[PDB]
Amino acid sequence: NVIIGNQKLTINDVARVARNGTLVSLTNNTDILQGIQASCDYINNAVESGEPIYGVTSGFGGMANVAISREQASELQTNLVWFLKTGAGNKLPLADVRAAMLLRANSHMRGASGIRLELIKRMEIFLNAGVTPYVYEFGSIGDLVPLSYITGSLIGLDPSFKVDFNGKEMDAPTALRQLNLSPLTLLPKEGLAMMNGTSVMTGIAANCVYDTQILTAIAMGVHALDIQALNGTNQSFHPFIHNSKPHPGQLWAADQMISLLANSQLVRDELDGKHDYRDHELIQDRYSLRCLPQYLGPIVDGISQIAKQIEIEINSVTDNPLIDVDNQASYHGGNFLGQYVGMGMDHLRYYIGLLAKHLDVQIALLASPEFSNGLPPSLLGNRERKVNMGLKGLQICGNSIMPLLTFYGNSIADRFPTHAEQFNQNINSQGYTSATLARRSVDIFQNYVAIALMFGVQAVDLRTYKKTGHYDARASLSPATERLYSAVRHVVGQKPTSDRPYIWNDNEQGLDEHIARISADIAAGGVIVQAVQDIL
Amino acid sequence: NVIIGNQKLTINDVARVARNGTLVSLTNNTDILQGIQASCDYINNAVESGEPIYGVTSGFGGMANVAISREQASELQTNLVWFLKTGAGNKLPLADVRAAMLLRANSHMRGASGIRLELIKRMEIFLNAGVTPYVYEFGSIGDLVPLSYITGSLIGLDPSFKVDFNGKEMDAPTALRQLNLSPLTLLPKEGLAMMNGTSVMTGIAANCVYDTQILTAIAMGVHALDIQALNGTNQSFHPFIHNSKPHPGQLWAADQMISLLANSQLVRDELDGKHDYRDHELIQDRYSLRCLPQYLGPIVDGISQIAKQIEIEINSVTDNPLIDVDNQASYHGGNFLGQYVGMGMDHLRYYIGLLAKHLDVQIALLASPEFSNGLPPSLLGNRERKVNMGLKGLQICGNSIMPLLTFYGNSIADRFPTHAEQFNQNINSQGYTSATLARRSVDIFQNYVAIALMFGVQAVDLRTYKKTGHYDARASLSPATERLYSAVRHVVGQKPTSDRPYIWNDNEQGLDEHIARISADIAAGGVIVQAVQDIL
Amino acid sequence: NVIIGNQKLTINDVARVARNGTLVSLTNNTDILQGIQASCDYINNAVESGEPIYGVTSGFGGMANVAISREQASELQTNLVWFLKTGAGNKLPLADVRAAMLLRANSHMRGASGIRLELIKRMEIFLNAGVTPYVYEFGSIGDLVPLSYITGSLIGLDPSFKVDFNGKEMDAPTALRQLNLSPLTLLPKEGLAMMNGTSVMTGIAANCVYDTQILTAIAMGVHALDIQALNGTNQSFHPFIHNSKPHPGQLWAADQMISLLANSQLVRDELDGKHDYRDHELIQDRYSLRCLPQYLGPIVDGISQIAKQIEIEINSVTDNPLIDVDNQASYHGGNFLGQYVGMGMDHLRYYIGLLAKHLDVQIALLASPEFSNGLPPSLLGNRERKVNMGLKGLQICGNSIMPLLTFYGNSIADRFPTHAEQFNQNINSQGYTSATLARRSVDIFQNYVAIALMFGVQAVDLRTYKKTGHYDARASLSPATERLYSAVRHVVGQKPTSDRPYIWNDNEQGLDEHIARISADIAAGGVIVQAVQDILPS
């Protein structure tokens, strides 16, 4: 179903395999397989001759002044796995490891790494059988150490390497007995070819960008719900304003907001350019409404830029040395340095914090009667019961998540240690931890967006009540935001009705289970995600 | 065993109860109990009279313009728990919750919160029976929301509140049936008194400072091992140098290094002031050795300052309004704002990153033959086996942890949202997330220090070999570092011997299990901690 | 020379006007002047008809619920200049004030602002006569207050508005007297159209990008000289490696290094795949050299991204309300939010810090005989004089500037105040202080790079001495870095000679003067900058 070797992988391809279990297959294309065999031939012949190659007939890192004889060329590679067995911290999520292996297979198919096809198939097999090596969150300065757990597991080096076999923990040798596979012995270069790359960090980063794209589209849907709850105007998104300031991101954002807001009963419909006075209100919407597309443009634009860079990283040969069989040569290079990943993730986190903080400003308007254009304080539901404080707690919780996202928007690629590994790795990317930090930012932004969805949904109901005498917002919303509003209400198990808004009395729900249910629907690609799929 | 109500709690007291299960008891002192009853009396009488008190006969937050009648005064408090049920993220570790409850009990014993003794005893009971409410990592801007899970669990409000009962998950009502306790109904103020404070964040922060103090002492022991492995001099720590620059922290650090290094065979012993030329080496030790006490002083000093502030926070009445029975009055105040916690944790993280980074510089010297004063590259063990790269992987992993600690040393208290809860909480501490971030920094610094311990231990062995012809460093070290070296070797299960250093061949251990075993010994207060207990 | 209103302005166009005093003209395009006229007539009409329009018949920001009538519509615009006269701190460099007026004139030509041509012409005249209003570094959250000093000066509103007139401080009414210009009265909307855009911050930013593109080219030239000095190999830059990791930036970095190093005698020329054991030393160059194209890729690429976004912001209409004469409507909108400028500048400072850190690591290699591959300690010249310590103080100084560049690499866009201006401006960009902050980054970087260049020139002299027994690197360097080498030696006034390297004895020069002289030459677009002309249009 996903074919490896032929065409370039997309972030979506990566995500299908990682999360959804999408089957994988190596191309059968004989030029591709010839390439793989040719570099293999080449490395074999070079070691036969005792020729100097980095990490083949040489030590590793700042010990690349230790020459290694033809007779210790295999063992060299097997020892590489051992001394790199020094991971720590929590485990990566299994989907990031699936992603890693898919990328490594992709790297190898290019025929410049000198690795046996049989070692590449081992990953196809693990992918299809649902065997996932354990990889730790610490050990890479950007992925030798994380990739040695992948390799040692693939070759069944030792019972000390653990794996997940469809939800069961077991040792790698045992997993290979179950798969009817024999243990493998690394040939010269093959350890290095297994371990000397950016597959893991890029793997984590591929899934981050996937989830961030989605959350951006959900966030867009949230603002659209906010603008309606607020009786804001659609004029701000008028194509004339944005064509005269034509950043791609701003042009896209304003135009998507037009689609989102179209045919809404709750919005001030003023694409004609009407804007009479209002009281007690200001003649214009506040900045969070009015400058939405100018604010969001660079964010939208940056997430695209990063998506574009990750896609090249995913389809790169990322490894050292690179075999050039056409010239019967090998080169010592630096493609293992994941600078696009380390910096793109620093960027991704920074943008997520900027999205969260804008959304939180929309909530502050909603909750505050000074700024909500006539909604009850904290969007309380039942005003006959004076003890209700409505969403006061839900706001505070959102006020606690958002600062943290901006904190995580701090960077890490500039914090690299110049003394790293014997002073040999005097520049490095910090790409691996940057990528795991990015995963942290996305996991937390998912809970954040869930809270923002809750505010939006409750708010339109309470605006509907001001408009119609009832709480069933579905006919008053634009058809596009009605899909999302009704996806959210489906997930949380509260059906829209005319006599009740989403939240009536405080003692009637735990708001925590709604956050949890919504975050889990977003994470799983559920009905909330599908409701905004046209934006993606 | 730990008595609550009498004398001020220490960070050590907090830690014993949280981690070690130390029993707890309310004082029987009748002046203390009179105080508790008096404020209770006072609040009861005030509500009888319909008198305006914040969060008693009033709404909460920016809805404190909603007056609340005497007849809805109880329900008001019960609803406070419900609308604050909006936590998200991972759970706090159980020891931080034990700490919270201990602090809340401590707060309440001061007789200014107007809460029933019976509600204070409920916490004594939960503490002693090993019942630990679930609290989420998100919801507080600094602790209403986290404390509502504590309260609802203590009073068995609903099956939706979960708890840990000695390692088993169950619902709070069920836990109270098992403890033969009846559900409670909150009286006016009591919800607020349960929830309106800094007990959780301070709870988390108490245990962070405890663990950081320990890790500082271990880190000191590490440097002492490094200075020996390097054949550095003891002259740098000479009391004359430091008395003339007499910062407390620097005076303490240099003087402790004297004790640590005393009677070592591996150190250049030069307190007499001898310093002849050396070759090929520089006449002086590099800065990481020589400026150790000047560098560490402000760190040591800051950790003390923070310890001092947390101890006041732990023994504070932290709550609003405060009942003054002596004047038969109540005051609206701000003691719920955890500014010392939010800022002290920002500081604590920043220092941890500075400790990690200095230690990592000591490792770079150890691993690099240009700077190690004659040790093998990467501290390899068996040089007859050319494939050994020794600790190359262990270094890279340390190079990946340290940048992250400095990243976490970024601050959060300055990132507070001024729009928080209806614009009412226009300043806030971010103390709760700061504190959980601090816990992150300590959990990671524990794995970091484990790696540094491994470098030190291996290094002295390899220096011993240069000195004596064997690998048993125990008689060549100072008696103080021999305790720590032998604690580490005990934990990892490798016994010192004359024919073998800690690490001989790479394929002979997984370095990951050693990191894990050491971090877990440090976390549990094991033999590594005890080995440096004289420093604390 | 630079015609405003016709075609899109580039960052080169802006820099030439701001820095080089290039002359400027408004286009005579009749469709362009008709549009300007039409929006002018639209506002005239709407206002006399009593139409409600923001900041024209209201009420600014949080007080946009003040109805103001046509009888007060003129005095509203004039009072807008007064209450905005609240700048603080140091003054903008005059070049960024010139850029700021260039872009504001450019914005107005597009026809959606309803401003008198005569006021757009007034900016042309100031630019060409070399009259520059004083503008302060604080007052904008991203440019009402800064642009109010431009406006106030242009119309000669009051003697307290100050200008530079070709080097002499002067009040603004005095400068209009010298120009034989009459003071102007702002009609309805004109004051807002004058002050409600992104011209200043985008002005500051455009000059930043220009200076960074240049410092990137020089940086590359510095790496090429370090590579030569350390007898590194050209093999890292082989197209086969980078074609298999085809990031645009990394391809470009690799390919420019192949060009910079072409026909050097100080490299190990191994594009054939040759890689013998060194003795007793590492078979590969360290990461600073070997992962150079991979490390520089995102930076090159990011600077290009920013440059593209700034070129769009330069050419955008930034005010509010916007007049659409085709449908006879004005729209209330948000183009005045310079979000691209705030986050872009954030990114730019970040990238500069990253360039600096890589350069400083290369200096570490050169100064240290453990890693220099046989060069003398601290790149010392006269070894016979034992008291010499060569470039030891010069490295310390570089070590004190590089961490400060990475510090400035922190962001400010994410630190916006949500309670800004009566809670009306609940999102904002911080773009003005962000670009202000980028100017400080760029200025410091010009000093850092001078230090970097000095380490490179000295080191190739000493390597050439290693190779040939003399100190003239000119013959041994690749043509492309010879140009740069000679341009630096020219600027500091110490000639290449076979007998002597750049730095012989410590007491023969103040290194501080050499830093100052190279820094000034880069800032001025002098011979050091011309030496890397080739790298620039790519």
- d(CA C294, CA B129) in angstroms, rounded, equals 59
- d(CA B501, CA B465) in angstroms, rounded, equals 9
In angstroms, what separates the C-alpha of B387 from chain A's closest C-alpha?
A: 5
CB A461 within 8 A of CB A432: no
DSSP A56-101: TSB-SGGGTTSB--GGGHHHHHHHHHHHT---EEEEPPHHHHHHHH
Q: Tell me: is residue B290 an annotated ligand-binding position.
A: yes
Q: For residue C390, which phi and psi values (nearest 5 degrees)?
A: 50, -125
What residues of B are in contact with residue C423 (Cβ under 8 Å)? Answer: 423
Give the helix ranges, DSSP H, for C420-510: 420-424, 431-468, 479-492
Residue of A nearest to C58 (CA): A283
b/e per residue, C352-364, with b = 16+ CB within 10 A?
Answer: bbbbbbbbbbbbb
Residue of A nearest to B422 (CA): A368
Chains that touch A (3 or more CB pairs under 8 A): B, C
| Token pair for A432 | 């691996």
Question: Among partner residues C275, C330, C343, which is closest to A273 by beta-carbon distance?
Answer: C330
- d(CA C358, CA C288) in angstroms, rounded, equals 7
What residues of A are in contact with residue C316 (Cβ under 8 Å)? Answer: 244-247
Structure resolution, Å: 2.2
Query: Is the Cβ pair B419, C417 closer than 8 Å?
Result: no
**Residue B3: which H helix or E strand, with range?**
strand B2-4
Contact residues of C toward B, CB < 8 A: 370-371, 415, 417-419, 423, 426
Sign of the Cα torsion A511, A515, A518, A524 reads: negative
Instruction: Please give the radius of gyration of chain A, using alpha carbons only, rounded to the nearest integer.
Output: 27
**Position of tokens 């707690």?**
A393
Q: Which of A51, A108, A230, A275 to mutate to test the interface with C (most CBs of C within 10 A)?
A: A275
In angstroms, what separates the C-alpha of B231 from chain C's closest C-alpha?
A: 20
Q: How was this structure determined?
A: X-ray
**Residue C119: which H helix or E strand, with range?**
helix C117-129
Our CA angle for C183, C184, C190, nearest 5°, is: 150
| Token pair for A54 | 């980095």
CB B393 within 8 A of CB A83: yes
Amino acid identity of residue B23, one-letter, is L
Catalytic residues of B, by residue number, are 54
Give the residue ranges of the annotated binding site of A.
196, 284, 290, 320, 392, 421, 424
CB A421 within 8 A of CB C357: no
- d(CA A385, CA A397) in angstroms, rounded, equals 23
Angle of helix A339-367 relative to helix A392-408, nearest 10 degrees?
160
Q: Beta-carbon neighbour count of residue B7 at 10 Å?
A: 10
| Token pair for A34 | 């010839």
Amino acid identity of residue C335, one-letter, is N
CB B113 within 8 A of CB B319: yes
**Position of tokens 């914040």?**
B54
Q: Beta-carbon neighbour count of residue C285 at 10 Å?
A: 24
Sign of the Cα torsion B464, B469, B472, B477 reads: negative
C-alpha pair distances (Å), C65 with each of A228, A283, C72, C424? 21, 6, 15, 12
C-alpha pair distances (Å), A116 with each of A74, A193, C507? 14, 10, 62
CB B269 within 8 A of CB B293: no
Length reported for chain B: 536
What chain C holds in terms of domains, given with CATH numbers, is 1-198 (1.10.275.10), 199-538 (1.20.200.10)
* Torsion angle of the four alpha carbons B392, B396, B402, B403, in this order, in degrees rounded to the nearest 10: 150
CB C56 within 8 A of CB C47: yes
DSSP C154-192: HTT--TTSEEEETTEEEEHHHHHHHTT-----PPTTHHH
C-alpha pair distances (Å), C17 with each of A97, C206, C304? 54, 12, 21
How far from chain centre, in Å, is Cα C361?
24
Give the residue ranges of the annotated binding site of A for (E)-cinnamate.
196, 284, 290, 320, 392, 421, 424
Q: Tell me: is residue C278 an annotated ligand-binding position.
A: no
Question: Among partner residues C52, C337, C411, which is closest to A291 by beta-carbon distance?
Answer: C337
- d(CA A348, CA C374) in angstroms, rounded, equals 43
| Token pair for A109 | 């198919």
**CA atoms within a 13 Å half-sphere pointing along the CA-CB vector of C130:** 9
Give the helix ranges, DSSP H, for C179-291: 190-195, 199-229, 239-243, 248-261, 287-290
| Token pair for C188 | 């309805």
Q: Beta-carbon neighbour count of residue C442 at 10 Å?
A: 23
In angstroms, what separates the C-alpha of A2 from chain B's closest C-alpha?
A: 33
Our CA angle for C368, C372, C377, nearest 5°, is: 40
CB C411 within 8 A of CB C344: no
Hey, which residues does B4 pair with through a beta bridge?
A: B26
Question: Among partner residues A52, A284, A406, which is closest to C276 by beta-carbon distance?
Answer: A52
- d(CA C348, CA C388) in angstroms, rounded, equals 39
- d(CA A423, CA C286) in angstroms, rounded, equals 8
Give SS3 for A227: helix
Q: Tell me: is residue C392 an annotated ligand-binding position.
A: yes
Chains that touch C (3 or more CB pairs under 8 A): A, B
DSSP B326: G
Q: Beta-carbon neighbour count of residue B371 at 10 Å?
A: 18
CB A455 within 8 A of CB A440: no
- d(CA B257, CA C246) in angstroms, rounded, equals 53
**Counts for chain A of helices (H) and strands (E), in that order:** 19, 9
Question: Among partner residues C52, C110, C344, which is closest to A283 by beta-carbon distance?
Answer: C52
Residue B103's nearest CA partner among B346, B323, B317, B337 is: B317
Query: Is the Cβ pair A426, C305 closer than 8 Å?
Result: no
- d(CA A160, CA B511) in angstroms, rounded, equals 11
Which is it for strands B162-165 and B131-133: parallel, antiparallel or unpaired? antiparallel
DSSP C376: P
- d(CA C253, CA C242) in angstroms, rounded, equals 10
Q: Which residues contact C220 (CB under 8 A, 6 or more apart)?
A: C253, C256, C257, C260, C296, C532, C535
Residue C114's nearest CA partner among C164, C149, C77 is: C77
Q: Which residues contact A230 (CB under 8 A, 6 or more apart)?
A: A285, A289, A365, A366, A372, A373, A459, A463
Q: Beta-carbon neighbour count of residue A6 at 10 Å?
A: 13
| Token pair for B95 | 């020891």
**CA atoms within a 13 Å half-sphere pointing along the CA-CB vector of B119:** 29
How far from chain centre, in Å, is Cα B307?
10
**Residue A206: which H helix or E strand, with range?**
helix A199-229
DSSP B179: T
C-alpha pair distances (Å), A265 with each of A16, A219, A232, A474, A534? 38, 21, 11, 10, 21
C-alpha pair distances (Å), B312 with each of B5, B333, B429, C115, C121? 15, 18, 17, 64, 67
Q: Which of C192, C282, C408 to mutate to test the interface with A (most CBs of A within 10 A)?
A: C282
The answer to whether the peptide bond before residue B490 is cis (omega within 30 degrees of 0) is no
Which is it for strands C136-138 and C2-4: parallel, antiparallel or unpaired? unpaired
**Residue C88: which H helix or E strand, with range?**
strand C88-91
CB A58 within 8 A of CB A52: yes
**CA atoms within a 13 Å half-sphere pointing along the CA-CB vector of B175:** 31
Residue B420's nearest CA partner among B138, B146, B135, B142 is: B142
Surface-to-core class of residue A276, CB atoms within 10 Å of its CB (0-12 exposed, 13-18 middle, 19+ buried): exposed
- d(CA B336, CA B351) in angstroms, rounded, equals 26
Longest dimension (CA), chain A: 90
Q: Which of A54, A138, A160 to mutate to test the interface with B (most CBs of B within 10 A)?
A: A138
Which H, E and C letters describe A311-356, residue by residue?
HHHHCCCCCCCEEEHHHCEEECCCCCCCHHHHHHHHHHHHHHHHHH
CB pairs under 8 A between A and C: 283
- d(CA C225, CA C482) in angstroms, rounded, equals 9
Contact residues of B toward C, CB < 8 A: 370-371, 415, 417-419, 423, 426
Q: Which of C418, C421, C426 to mutate to test the interface with B (most CBs of B within 10 A)?
A: C418
**Residue B224: which H helix or E strand, with range?**
helix B199-229
Q: For residue C532, which phi and psi values (nearest 5 degrees)?
A: -105, 20
Residue A134's nearest CA partner among A160, A104, A115 is: A160
Residue of A nearest to B346 (CA): A407
DSSP C137: E
Give SS3 for B170: strand
DSSP C537: T
Given the residues C54, C134, C340, C350, the one annotated as active site:
C54
DSSP B333: -
| Token pair for B27 | 């004082």
What residues of C are in contact with residue B415 (Cβ under 8 Å)? Answer: 415
| Token pair for C186 | 């702002």
Give the helix ranges, DSSP H, for C381-430: 392-407, 420-424
| Token pair for A364 | 């502050």
Amino acid identity of residue A84, one-letter, is L
- d(CA A452, CA A448) in angstroms, rounded, equals 6
Instruction: Please give the radius of gyration of chain C, using alpha carbons only, rounded to the nearest integer.
Output: 27
**Residue C26: which H helix or E strand, with range?**
strand C24-26
Give SS3 for A161: coil
| Token pair for A17 | 């395999």
| Token pair for B381 | 């063990």
Question: Among partner residues A85, A392, A399, which is closest to B141 by beta-carbon distance?
Answer: A399
Q: Tell me: is residue C196 an annotated ligand-binding position.
A: yes
Give the helix ranges, DSSP H, for B235-338: 239-243, 248-261, 287-290, 292-314
| Token pair for A285 | 């919407």
CB B319 within 8 A of CB B336: yes
CB pairs under 8 A between B and C: 14
Q: Tell me: is residue C190 an annotated ligand-binding position.
A: no
Hey, which residues does C38 pair with through a beta bridge?
A: none
Residue of B nearest to A407 (CA): B412
- d(CA A200, CA A150) in angstroms, rounded, equals 10
CB C492 within 8 A of CB C476: no
Amino acid identity of residue B357, one-letter, is K
Amino acid identity of residue B89, one-letter, is G
Angle of helix C292-314 relative to helix C11-20, nearest 10 degrees?
80
Query: Is the Cβ pair B419, C419 closer than 8 Å?
Result: yes
Question: Among partner residues A136, A397, A402, which is closest to B86 by beta-carbon distance?
Answer: A397
- d(CA A501, CA A376) in angstroms, rounded, equals 13
- d(CA A75, CA A68) in angstroms, rounded, equals 10
Instruction: Please give the radius of gyration of chain B, using alpha carbons only, rounded to the nearest integer.
Output: 27
Residue B425's nearest CA partner among B145, B133, B182 is: B145
CB A252 within 8 A of CB C38: no
CB A414 within 8 A of CB C352: no
